[PDB]
Structure 1
Amino acid sequence: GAGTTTTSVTVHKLLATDGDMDKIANELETGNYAGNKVGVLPANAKEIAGVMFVWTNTNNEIIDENGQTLGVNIDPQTFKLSGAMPATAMKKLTEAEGAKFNTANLPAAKYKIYEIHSLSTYVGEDGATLTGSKAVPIEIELPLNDVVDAHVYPKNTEAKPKIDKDFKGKANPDTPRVDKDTPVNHQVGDVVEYEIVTKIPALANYATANWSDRMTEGLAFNKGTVKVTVDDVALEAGDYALTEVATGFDLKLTDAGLAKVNDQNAEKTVKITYSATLNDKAIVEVPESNDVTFNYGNNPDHGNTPKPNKPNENGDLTLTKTWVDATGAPIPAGAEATFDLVNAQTGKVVQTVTLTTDKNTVTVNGLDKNTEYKFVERSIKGYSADYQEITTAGEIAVKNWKDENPKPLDPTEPKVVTYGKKFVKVNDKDNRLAGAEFVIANADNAGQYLARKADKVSQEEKQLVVTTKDALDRAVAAYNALTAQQQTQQEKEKVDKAQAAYNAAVIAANNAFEWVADKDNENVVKLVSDAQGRFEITGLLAGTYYLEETKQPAGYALLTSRQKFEVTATSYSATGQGIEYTAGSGKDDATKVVNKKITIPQTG
């Protein structure tokens, strides 16, 4: 005999499906006299499970079921706990018909019951979380007058955040750009400026709020360009933890940071801006992309964004899944796990795979070994996706944490793409000529010549260019000092090998472009024909350019004219251009550059 005549209390957690909790109260007022089970609920309220309730004494100190204090306090204003939830605390999660506490051993007194957002599992429709609350904490003095089995009705609203990522200026969470997947033409060295705009509801109660971005290889994330504002106002050094990696970043609100978006009177607007440079690994007509995820919850969250990866040499790529609980400790497979294999350059779905509870891995074959892909986990209720950092080609690992948080926000991303042109050097009988050197101009007659910016190329890159150039010079000279019959496949390979090395060196040196006056300058992009007469230019914006030959094939004359050419969205790959880049390939994807040769005749 220590407790009271009120031997049980049941907490029913009510959700205001509209925004009106006051209206819920203004039906429970007029309905009751004392605290018995309400037979029927307002049309405006709904009872939800998965909300955690814990008992306190009148001073906000957590108690066990005999009313003993447990030396952890809860702040009456923020609801924040001063320690870890004590193991023997009188706490329980609501089930469909509420949380029924046994109150039989509690001494006569005043008590509080709090909602602990941070320890609940509830998740609304379309990933909404509980925001505002009315009549929390519950103040109940025991015994409840006349009642032995009491029932109480704490109230809540729920809300959802919104997001979109797009180029600087274009980001709109309410109506994302519909033609986003359409790549925008850019040249190498361009700085791409991105914008992330997140709307966070009023009275948010986030424990986590992390943004994570990962980029395909052809985009270099520009470190130190990240800026974050909340309603236009810059966050402070201590409001977030920013970690920067070669392929992008993770941005996490701290407690001071969350303070600024949580428990606020109006929808709040978070903006994160930053840039990336399209670099020398961009493959022509192959989009590059960023990819952001927003991982949030009333409970802490461990999910993040996928990491693109390439298949191994065999065109094989393997996903491997592991599972853990909110503390990081191993647990058995939570459920079926479905993933979409997305081509990471384009943003399009390659195929779908499912992992049954018993088989934690899957391998997909027949993939392009030059193409980056990602397995995007389809939302598993209760579970957040942690994509592990990439250590090797052909392997992607995913860890499933049982946070019990809403599905993450995953905006679509824009794309960017460079264009290019291919050529073959021939005589008038289509014989492929080696060693013809070319530069690119911006007019048929005067104008400037294409170069890489001096300030955007190091000395190592520069000398590799001249070293391979010199090397090529020698191979061409040797091949030219042979005769028609002696210039067989094996000898042409020699020239092809050297020209390939040169060509890669230029592509690597071409980190940026500028137009200049002098064709003699060292930075001028020079193109050279291989023994199959081939040369290409990659990394360009669309437009009209003009080849100028600077040194003709041995035995031939110098062209006294520039050759006009068009760079387009398909000029690098389109068939029907007049000649095979590589003989016998079946695709005439190049333009012929026809050299002339003066001959001295005879008579009689």
Structure 2
Amino acid sequence: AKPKIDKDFKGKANPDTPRVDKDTPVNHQVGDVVEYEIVTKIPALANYATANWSDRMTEGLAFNKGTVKVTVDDVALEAGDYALTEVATGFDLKLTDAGLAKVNDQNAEKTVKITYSATLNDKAIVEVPESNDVTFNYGNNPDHGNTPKPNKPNENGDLTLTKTWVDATGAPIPAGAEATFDLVNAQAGKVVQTVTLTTDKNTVTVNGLDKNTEYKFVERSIKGYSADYQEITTAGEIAVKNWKDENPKPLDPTEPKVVTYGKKFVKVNDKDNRLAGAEFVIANADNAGQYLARKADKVSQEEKQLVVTTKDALDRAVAAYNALTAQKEKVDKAQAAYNAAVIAANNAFEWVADKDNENVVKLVSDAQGRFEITGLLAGTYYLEETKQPAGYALLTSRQKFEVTATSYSATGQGIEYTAGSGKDDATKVVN
């Protein structure tokens, strides 16, 4: 009777028997190309006027335009069978009359498969998942529904919902019913707040949200109305239009999640004094092996140049600081600028045999001894010091560290990343 849907990583999707652990994010490294598949079962003897799929992704996943492929019963559709619209944050794929004829009026269940990919990018934050979000909007009447578009709150934590209503022709009409929405953290898929719009007030502001987190208002199905989520035009505002299409509720599968990991370090001496200007690379073995580098063909000339120029300025700041008596915030700022340039340039990682390779990632301690690495797979890695802090001997041994699902954030480690934090969330490196 009703169609069935699932979305998962390529090869895992199963509309009949969806995977049990979907909610648990799968560890990837920055630059990974994540392959997705949507599988939809359409019943025999269907007579749909609309069969539309739409997907929107959180900002750390860059939809790869041109990667969409669609098959029915493992047979490729023709260009004329669907209308595909691609945007920075995803796509909409709508069957034309020609495409509908291939899933309608069939004597057996039809299986639609849509595959595509997205690239995990440098906007991803360690331990915060990234996600897509597919909705299948269908019915015997034309349907105007689509998938939610995630959005961040305004600077002060406010996110506002506005709802309007139209008939099947697009003409405004009064609210047809009370409308309930679940405000969902779009990264993790957890509901944070439920709101209800009465028939006389079509807007509501939710306060206290995280300005660096994406959310979405997911409409609970209202009988005979389809939810058309408007493109995002500004932070802190989400608009929804309800069409009186008189179609069934849409299909809304449980999407998988991806996540990257990281590690924090503090450079100190034997008295726990924090040291600026120590430089390190990362190796994949306790001796020999390879070193962590950004992939040269995935980084622009401008991105590479910024790493170099900010490093030069950091070198100058470290020099000027080291000249000061015990009795510079300049170092911290310069180091943060360099760190930001490194993150922006680290679009993808690879392992290289030559530690002198110009693309090898180089970490530098600030005036609080701090340095860090983000965007990694879990594993056992090894720091190698390449430049000692002024006045100290070069370390001779590599230092083992473990990257895990909580290694960036957890206490129970060597030292406070930032003194006084109360969290021992960094690896201690002693000079």
Length-normalised TM-score, structure 2: 0.99
Query: Offset at 1:492?
Result: 2.3
User: Could you tell me how far apart the structure 1 residues matched to 2:12 and 2:79 are?
Assistant: 27
User: Could you tell me how far apart the structure 2 residues matched to 1:330 and 1:230 are?
Assistant: 37
Deviations 1:500-520 (A, max 9, x none): 010011111111111111111
Are residue 191 (structure 1) and residue 33 (structure 2) matched?
Answer: yes
Query: Offset at 1:329?
Result: 0.8
User: Could you tell me how far apart the structure 2 residues matched to 1:443 and 1:177 are?
Assistant: 35
Query: Offset at 1:266?
Result: 0.7
Deviations 1:82-122 (A, max 9, x none): xxxxxxxxxxxxxxxxxxxxxxxxxxxxxxxxxxxxxxxxx
User: Could you tell me how far apart the structure 2 residues matched to 1:350 and 1:530 are?
Assistant: 37
Deviations 1:512-543 (A, max 9, x none): 11111111111000000001110000000000
Query: Offset at 1:392?
Result: 0.7
Query: Offset at 1:176?
Result: 1.1
User: Could you tell me how far apart the structure 1 residues matched to 2:280 and 2:176 are?
Assistant: 62
Map 1:84-483 → 2, pairs under 5 A: 159-483=1-325
3-state SS of paired residue (2:308): helix
3-state SS of paired residue (1:260): helix
Map 1:576-595 → 2, pairs under 5 A: 576-595=412-431
Query: Offset at 1:195?
Result: 0.7
User: Could you tell me how far apart the structure 1 residues matched to 2:280 and 2:305 are?
Assistant: 19
Query: Offset at 1:481?
Result: 1.0
User: Could you tell me how far apart the structure 2 residues matched to 1:235 and 1:482 are?
Assistant: 70
3-state SS of paired residue (1:389): coil
User: Could you tell me how far apart the structure 1 residues matched to 2:263 and 2:182 are?
Assistant: 34
User: Could you tell me how far apart the structure 2 residues matched to 1:362 and 1:412 are?
Assistant: 27
Query: Offset at 1:577?
Result: 0.6
Query: Offset at 1:493?
Result: 1.5
Query: Offset at 1:422?
Result: 0.2
Query: Offset at 1:578?
Result: 2.1
Deviations 1:399-452 (A, max 9, x none): 000000000000010001001100001011111110000000011111111001
Query: Offset at 1:177?
Result: 1.1
Query: Offset at 1:203?
Result: 1.0
Structure with larger RCO (C-alpha < 8 A, sep 6+): 2
Structure 1: any 5+ residue segments left out of the alignment? 1-158, 485-490, 596-604
3-state SS of paired residue (2:103): coil
3-state SS of paired residue (2:80): coil
User: Could you tell me how far apart the structure 1 residues matched to 2:260 and 2:301 are?
Assistant: 25
User: Could you tell me how far apart the structure 2 residues matched to 1:274 and 1:460 are?
Assistant: 29
Deviations 1:15-67 (A, max 9, x none): xxxxxxxxxxxxxxxxxxxxxxxxxxxxxxxxxxxxxxxxxxxxxxxxxxxxx
Q: Aligned match of 2:337 in 495, 501, 522? A: 501
Deviations 1:207-266 (A, max 9, x none): 110000000000010111100001111000100000000000000000000010011111
Query: Offset at 1:586?
Result: 1.1
User: Could you tell me how far apart the structure 2 residues matched to 1:543 and 1:215 are?
Assistant: 27
User: Could you tell me how far apart the structure 1 residues matched to 2:75 and 2:287 are?
Assistant: 53
Spell out structure 1 runs of 4+ moving beyond 2 A.
none
Q: Aligned match of 2:353 in 517, 522, 532? A: 517
3-state SS of paired residue (2:337): helix
User: Could you tell me how far apart the structure 2 residues matched to 1:492 and 1:269 are?
Assistant: 64
Q: Aligned match of 2:378 in 542, 552, 569? A: 542
User: Could you tell me how far apart the structure 2 residues matched to 1:191 and 1:581 are?
Assistant: 32
User: Could you tell me how far apart the structure 1 residues matched to 2:381 and 2:4 are?
Assistant: 44
User: Could you tell me how far apart the structure 2 residues matched to 1:428 and 1:243 are?
Assistant: 60
User: Could you tell me how far apart the structure 1 residues matched to 2:53 and 2:305 are?
Assistant: 41
Query: Offset at 1:351?
Result: 1.3
Query: Offset at 1:591?
Result: 1.1
User: Could you tell me how far apart the structure 1 residues matched to 2:201 and 2:391 are?
Assistant: 67
3-state SS of paired residue (1:371): coil
Structure 2: any 5+ residue segments left out of the alignment? none
Query: Offset at 1:183?
Result: 0.3
User: Could you tell me how far apart the structure 2 residues matched to 1:534 and 1:495 are?
Assistant: 11
User: Could you tell me how far apart the structure 1 residues matched to 2:375 and 2:287 are?
Assistant: 24
Deviations 1:364-389 (A, max 9, x none): 11111111001100000110000000
Partner residue in 2 for 1:134: none
The structure with the largest alpha-carbon Rg is 1
Deviations 1:449-482 (A, max 9, x none): 1001111111010000001000101000000111
User: Could you tell me how far apart the structure 2 residues matched to 1:165 and 1:592 are?
Assistant: 42
Aligned-residue sequence identity (percent) comes to 100
User: Could you tell me how far apart the structure 2 residues matched to 1:358 and 1:397 are?
Assistant: 17
3-state SS of paired residue (2:79): coil
Query: Offset at 1:277?
Result: 0.7
User: Could you tell me how far apart the structure 2 residues matched to 1:499 and 1:200 are?
Assistant: 56
Query: Offset at 1:483?
Result: 1.1
Name the stretch that deviates more: 576-585 or 189-198.
576-585
Count matched residues. 431
User: Could you tell me how far apart the structure 2 residues matched to 1:525 and 1:322 are?
Assistant: 50
User: Could you tell me how far apart the structure 2 residues matched to 1:263 and 1:520 are?
Assistant: 64
Query: Offset at 1:585?
Result: 1.2
Partner residue in 2 for 1:567: 403
